[PDB]
Amino acid sequence: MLNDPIKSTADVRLDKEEVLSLLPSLKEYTKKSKELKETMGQMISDSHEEEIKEVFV
Amino acid sequence: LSKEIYDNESELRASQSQQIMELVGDIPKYSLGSELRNRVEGEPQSTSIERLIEDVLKL
């Protein structure tokens, strides 16, 4: 299952600002994903997963 | 005489039928999809977003 490209628009470029304003909840999903990745990275760095993964083998 | 009158009027009608078929096309048929001409003729009774997407990129 590849990252399928957008269909051919016959020289109409992908205006990301217009389609981003067309789907305004995507910015809310983006900031929620940023907060989730921030909290998960804070959980990961506290757990020393890479540290105990690299000190063993 | 009526046969010759009809033949002359058919010869006059030939140039008119060639001119009124060679007008501005105004985006004519046999160029759109099925759903575009079905929305032109009205009451399609079967909507399908995938065919609308695949036909709106063909205009």
Chain A contact present for B59, CB below 8 A = no
Cα–Cα distance measured from residue A17 to residue A23, given in angstroms and rounded to the nearest whole number: 10
Can you spell out the DSSP letters for A1-57? ---PPPPP-SS----HHHHHHHSTHHHHHHHHHHHHHHHHHHHHHHHTHHHHHHHH-
| Cβ–Cβ under 8 Å, residues B58 and B33 | yes
Burial class (CB in 10 A: 0-12, 13-18, 19+), B35: buried
To the nearest whole Å, the CA of B56 is away from the closest chain A CA by 10
Q: What is the resolution of this structure in A?
A: 4.2
CB A13 within 8 A of CB B59: no
Say whether residue B53 is in contact with chain A using an 8 A CB cutoff: yes
Could you tell me the maximum CA-CA distance found in chain A, to the nearest angstrom? 56
A-B Cβ pairs (cutoff 8 Å, strict): 5
Q: Name the structure determination technique.
A: cryo-EM
Which residue in B has a C-alpha nearest to residue A11's C-alpha? B57
> Please, are residues B23 and B49 in contact by the beta-carbon 8 Å criterion?
no
- The residue among B36, B57, B33 whose CA lies nearest residue A12 is B57
